[PDB]
Amino acid sequence: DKKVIATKVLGTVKWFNVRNGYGFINRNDTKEDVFVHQTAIKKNNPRKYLRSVGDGETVEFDVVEGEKGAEAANVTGPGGVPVQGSKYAA
Numbered sequence: 001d002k003k004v005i006a007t008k009v010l011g012t013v014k015w016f017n018v019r020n021g022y023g024f025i026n027r028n029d030t031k032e033d034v035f036v037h038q039t040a041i042k043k044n045n046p047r048k049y050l051r052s053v054g055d056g057e058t059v060e061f062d063v064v065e066g067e068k069g070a071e072a073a074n075v076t077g078p079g080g081v082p083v084q085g086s087k088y089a090a
Contacts, residue, residue: 005070006030006063010078016053018089023053025061025072034063036072043082050085059083 009029013036016023022037038051040061053059053075061075077083 003065004062005065008060008062008074010058010060011072012058013053013055015055016086018052018086021051023055025053025059025075027063028058032070034061034070034072035066035068036061036075040071040073040075041083042074043076043080045082045085048085048090050083050089052086052089054084054086057084 009027011025011027011034013023013025025034025036027034041051041053044050059075059077061072063070064073
């Protein structure tokens with residue numbers, strides 16, 4: 001079932017481009033850049049369905065092997081709570 005390089009780690013989203021549908025999350029545990037995709041967002045805000053991630057927000061995610069090296073997966077907010085998302089999305 002794929003390879004997991006790292007488990008639920010906390011990282012700060014440097015930025016996430018909604019148009020690109022992807023962004024980069026800086027791992028705050030290893031200080032390594034991690035690639036995140038909108039399909040890596042397991043939970044979305046229930047008030048509004050957004051495929052965006054809040055920039056500057058600290059989120060928790062698992063690290064799995066990606067074609068770019070490391071890919072974030074199961075991206076959720078702290079405690080497994082839904083991500084707020086970007087201020088403006090969709």
